[PDB]
């Protein structure tokens, strides 16, 4: 029942009249969306209440305004960058009618029902109705490589009435046509409508509708009437819904901000309880601590709880969000700057068009790739051929093999030949030139006749307009080998045989169809003989061969060799037809042609009658050229433990060939189809009415058509509860397939809709909880690009449908190596290094107030100067961690491509867990103990006691702030592995900036201006002049960092990471052999193990030549 | 799309960088030079601090048999407490006299902020309009308190005197210097008298004294350079202590002209006018005499800490060395 040849759009009125057509909201956006921004607005209120305030309002506005200002600045450049992205690439213009004549118009100046005009190689701006075209009968050939993966051309026809009345420009303007049709739908395979014009009703079908993703090919100009436009086009209806993408760590940081909030409430409540107790047996007896306020001890503890919320508020960071997005913004610019991801051929650099999803590039689990245009160049070339059992195509010279290094064959002896055919084999040439083996000549005569392509000679260049690239590849190849298809007529062809102008009479073209898997042509030679020429699949043709076929075995061996080389193979054959035999068949053939009741099946029946005894000529081999480095990229990302799935709208045969060419499917893999997959899933149902679907050691792959994908996924009061089983039954089936598909080395989904592509991506996100990357080109990949965690749009081409909806955009698939292994892998290390240290330096700084609480009566007296808390998070500790998050490198970029195994670190979320989070909080907790209790030990005794003795709170505060700044800036130097000059400058500049500003605040000049704000006048000069103060600062820093160095060394010595191992033997690594294809896997024992047949083509072309529709 | 990126080290992300690796030969040296540099410093601090000559007398007299418990309940507010202490070893060079208070939370937040710096800076406006922070001690009856604040109000107002009991048994007075006991910045920058006039009487017009103070701030001292907001004892107190247990410089006992020790070993008597009550909140008043050391003062904690940290660094180095050798 499921059909492997069609895309299942089914399992997923409108009226058209012709020619009758910036700072206020951003601050609010970052306030509400972020809980921390409202937290710091709440603290401002608590800081303005004199009953509870323990820190000046300066302490929070100054960090907050800087944080708010920097976020606004970043949001501005993103707004400007996005505008530049849209404007500079949406420069698409189409000719429209709005006055007496056509005139250039933008794609956005297109209304529903305005006559337009397109030229050769023009993308269709909107779903239109063919009104007229240059070639006869108002035909139009369009390639839908962007609407689906199909690489062949499809012809479209206009109404017989619009063709003969809207040819001229003048009448197109006056065309007042009324169209009723369905409302905008997503289903691209038919169109229900009617055209009311000239007091008559003309029904419409999809054969008259050009869709937006189409590209006009082989048509000088075509005029259409826009039916739908913009988001109403059937391709945009297939585009998913844009969602706000967030990283796996974005969600994590929210949980951690809530954890520090809970800790802050609990610490404040305990300290508030302690103060309530302290005020009972100590504070109330202290006459000097009399404030004339009849406050009960429990009221003072309640009243100081808000004091410790304010004092300990710096526990939750005020610069976490700016720091994270400033780091991602810089990391996103390294992608835009990478010259190793710059495609010079199309002048296309990589584009990080979302500056917010960066560390997720280092966590990808599954890649869902498009085929047509993403893994391929959309180029097919004739490579090899077997003739009489002799394979031609190997590097050969003269009449015997001499050397591998062979120069390109010289086609100068051929008049029509050009350089398009890069053939390295001279032995074949003597066979063609010598003529001692006429069957070699007959082999290439077939390729010049058995096609159905068209020829353009409007200026003498003999251009071939092939609807099938396979035919274009073969017809071009035969043209170079001396057999050129020159001219075509309804009844005759004018092939030139090595310069001999011979005109043959075509008696019948047995058209091609998917289930037929072959096409034939019957021609009458100039002598008068009738010959039938057939090319097609090896399986079908070998069922219709003559009994006496000596070359049958040798040709079969060549097909296996071509199949093992990942080439698309066809078998050639012919037979002799007697005059009496043909006229008997011709009489039946004509009857099946005129008989329109069952023409499709009537013609097929008579086709089988004449294709009975065929003599085998040989076989061809065609390469569908991949993009460079595609097999190399797939092998390396497999070493990174990334699974690559191919989701394409192209046929099953093309998808399987590219799977073999990409090395995704090898001769070891056993290929399972929808028939096989469905049976396994069923057996799992009755079995349960989890065991692995396959033995663990086997190698397997799934090639699944869209019809079978719906079949296996069940996507082809009483009502209420009845749905739960239907939904629950599907959900069990959805999970069983994902477990099955993820048990396979490779999975290929072919003939799938844009919705199905996103569906497959979404199933893996749901049932595997995996991070997914989707890469593709054209509008049929927009749905999964928007669905995936990361969406990459292959740029550099002429259609930018998938680029606009993508997170990232580079031209070549092979650049996925550096996007993940270099940029994403580092971005994850750098993001996690930043978070590991960022929460360290905020706990080490804030927990000092907690330890000082046990010596100041739990009174929320700050252990620092008021202005040190103001500038700590923006000046003294901001820059160094930003530079590490933008410059750190554990290994080289070249050494991180050589070892894709380093990528697995971020897939498993090993560098930043909830455990790594609490270990950095314990690191900050223990640092704050030493940062306080070492100075406390010194200050409990004599610390430079003379007239200028710094034994006071202010000197105590300056000492702890000095040791803290040195310690947290020396920790970031222990964390840094890539010590740049800017990294060194920031670490020592931050320490130098603290001392420079502190001495400026603790100065006579500023105190005179306003004594109230600055209370620490002269403290730094006195405190930092004492040897004990510096001996205390040095001891504190040493005790804070020495245990860290020992732990880092012991951890690196006993449990070295993969980066550590590579760095140790970095200078002793020299063996890096380049990737190589499996050159030979030939074997003996099976005549045929796999059919490498592939042919992209459609019905209806033979009927165009048979009649005069396509003949001008 | 756009043109080719420009090949710069930063943008191509290949800046000249030093790649430090925590190798066996890069971290072990720092665990030994630290160990070999911290140990001698700890010995130097420890031995030097022990060589400092110090005596500490607790004259709070909270526990009976101390001969001035009579001042815990001073029926007559002039209460004089006398304690005899003996210096077994003479004090050489300049000697510093301190008073210490324990369990005196001078770092309490409600206490630390109870001052008007603009007033103590000699601002005319702040003299007659004390800030709200010194709220309980802004105004006494109608006019504002000159040193407003819980800090100025709770000023240490004990008087300490030292006499040398000679062989004749006649107490010889010991000269005590009350000048140069505060920070120079505190004396000459932070604390200023209100402007204008030449007599402090008119300058501090229309202000009351702190309620706890016996006499106004006019005559904190007879010296015109040591009275007002620029009084040394007042400024020493105003500098709040970091921890509840602290000591504040009281007097300087300058080195004698003769070669004899400034405080020769013998019998001494401490005559203190008991004025400051601290026994309510379990406080302890003390008198400390300490000699000057060119390594600051007496800090045996830093000496021991350097020995401990230095010893552990050497111990860690050996442990790290063994671990590395096994995993070489
Ligand atoms: C000296 C005895 C250590 C006492 C702490 C007990 C040990 C402790 O809980 O953790 C030490 C904390 C955490 O601070 P650290 O970040 O320095 O500790 C981690 C360190 O980064 C390791 O190396 P690295 O991977 O980061 O390069 C890491 O290895 P790995 O990732 O392979 O596991 C390991 O993670 P793990 O624990 O296995 O999850 C931790 O030990 O702080 C310190 O480094 C020293 C803090 C003490 C500093 C003041 C001295 C009291
Ligand atoms: C030394 O300082 C202490 C306090 O540090 C002074 O004791 C305090 O004296 C004031 C009066 O000057 C007392 O304030 C009020 O006195 C009224 C009498 O008008 C009295 O009825 C109230 O009890 C009220 O407190 C204050 O209570 C008292 N404080 C203590 C702890 O005793 C002392 O007078 C000062 N002595 C010298 C010589 O400066
Ligand atoms: C202290 O000395 C004085 C006078 O020298 C004497 O009257 C008193 O009894 C002495 N007290 C003690 C405890 O020695
Ligand atoms: C102690 O000092 C006071 C005041 O200076 C004085 O009156 C007294 O005579 C001195 N000697 C004592 C109390 O033995
Ligand atoms: Mg594509």
Author numbering:
A (entry chain A): 16 to 27, 63 to 71, 106 to 773, 787 to 813, 833 to 1228
B (entry chain B): 24 to 351
Question: What do the study authors state?
Answer:
Lipid flippases actively transport lipids from the exoplasmic leaflet to the cytosolic leaflet of cellular membranes thereby creating and maintaining an asymmetric lipid distribution between the two leaflets. Most eukaryotic lipid flippases belong to the P4-ATPases subfamily of the P-type ATPase superfamily (with the sole known exception of ABCA4). The P-type ATPases share a common architecture with three cytosolic domains that are involved in the autocatalyzed ATP hydrolysis: the nucleotide-binding (N) domain binds ATP, the phosphorylation (P) domain contains a conserved aspartate residue, which is phosphorylated during the transport cycle, and the actuator (A) domain contains a conserved glutamate, which is responsible for the subsequent dephosphorylation of the phosphoenzyme intermediate, that enables the protein to return to its initial state5. Here, we present a total of nine cryo-electron microscopy structures of the human flippase ATP8B1-CDC50A complex at 2.4 to 3.1 Å overall resolution, along with functional and computational studies, addressing the autophosphorylation steps from ATP, substrate recognition and occlusion, as well as a phosphoinositide binding site.
Here, we collected cryo-EM data of the full-length ATP8B1-CDC50A complex preincubated with ATP and the activating lipid PI(3,4,5)P3. Upon data processing two different conformations were observed. In this conformation, TM1 and TM2 are tightly packed to the rest of the transmembrane helix bundle, thus masking the substrate recognition PISL motif of TM4 and closing the exoplasmic lipid entry. C-terminal autoregulation locks the A-domain thereby restricting TM1-2 movements required for the opening of the outward-oriented lipid entry pathway. To identify the phosphoinositide binding site in ATP8B1 we therefore determined the cryo-EM structures of the two full-length E2Pautoinhibited states and the E2Pactive state in the presence of PI(3,4,5)P3, for which ATP8B1 has a higher apparent affinity. For the three structures, a lipid density could be observed in a positively charged cavity formed by TM5, TM7, TM8, and TM10, similar to the PI(4)P and PI(3,5)P2 binding pockets of Drs2p and ATP13A2, respectively. The observed density is weaker compared to the surrounding protein, potentially indicating partial occupancy of the phosphoinositide binding site and/or flexibility of the ligand. In our experimental conditions (4 °C in LMNG/CHS/PI(3,4,5)P3 mixed micelles), the closed conformation seems to be favored, but the equilibrium could be poised toward the open conformation in a native membrane. Thus, our data indicate that the E2Pautoinhibited state of ATP8B1 explores both open and closed conformations, but only the open state can initiate lipid binding.
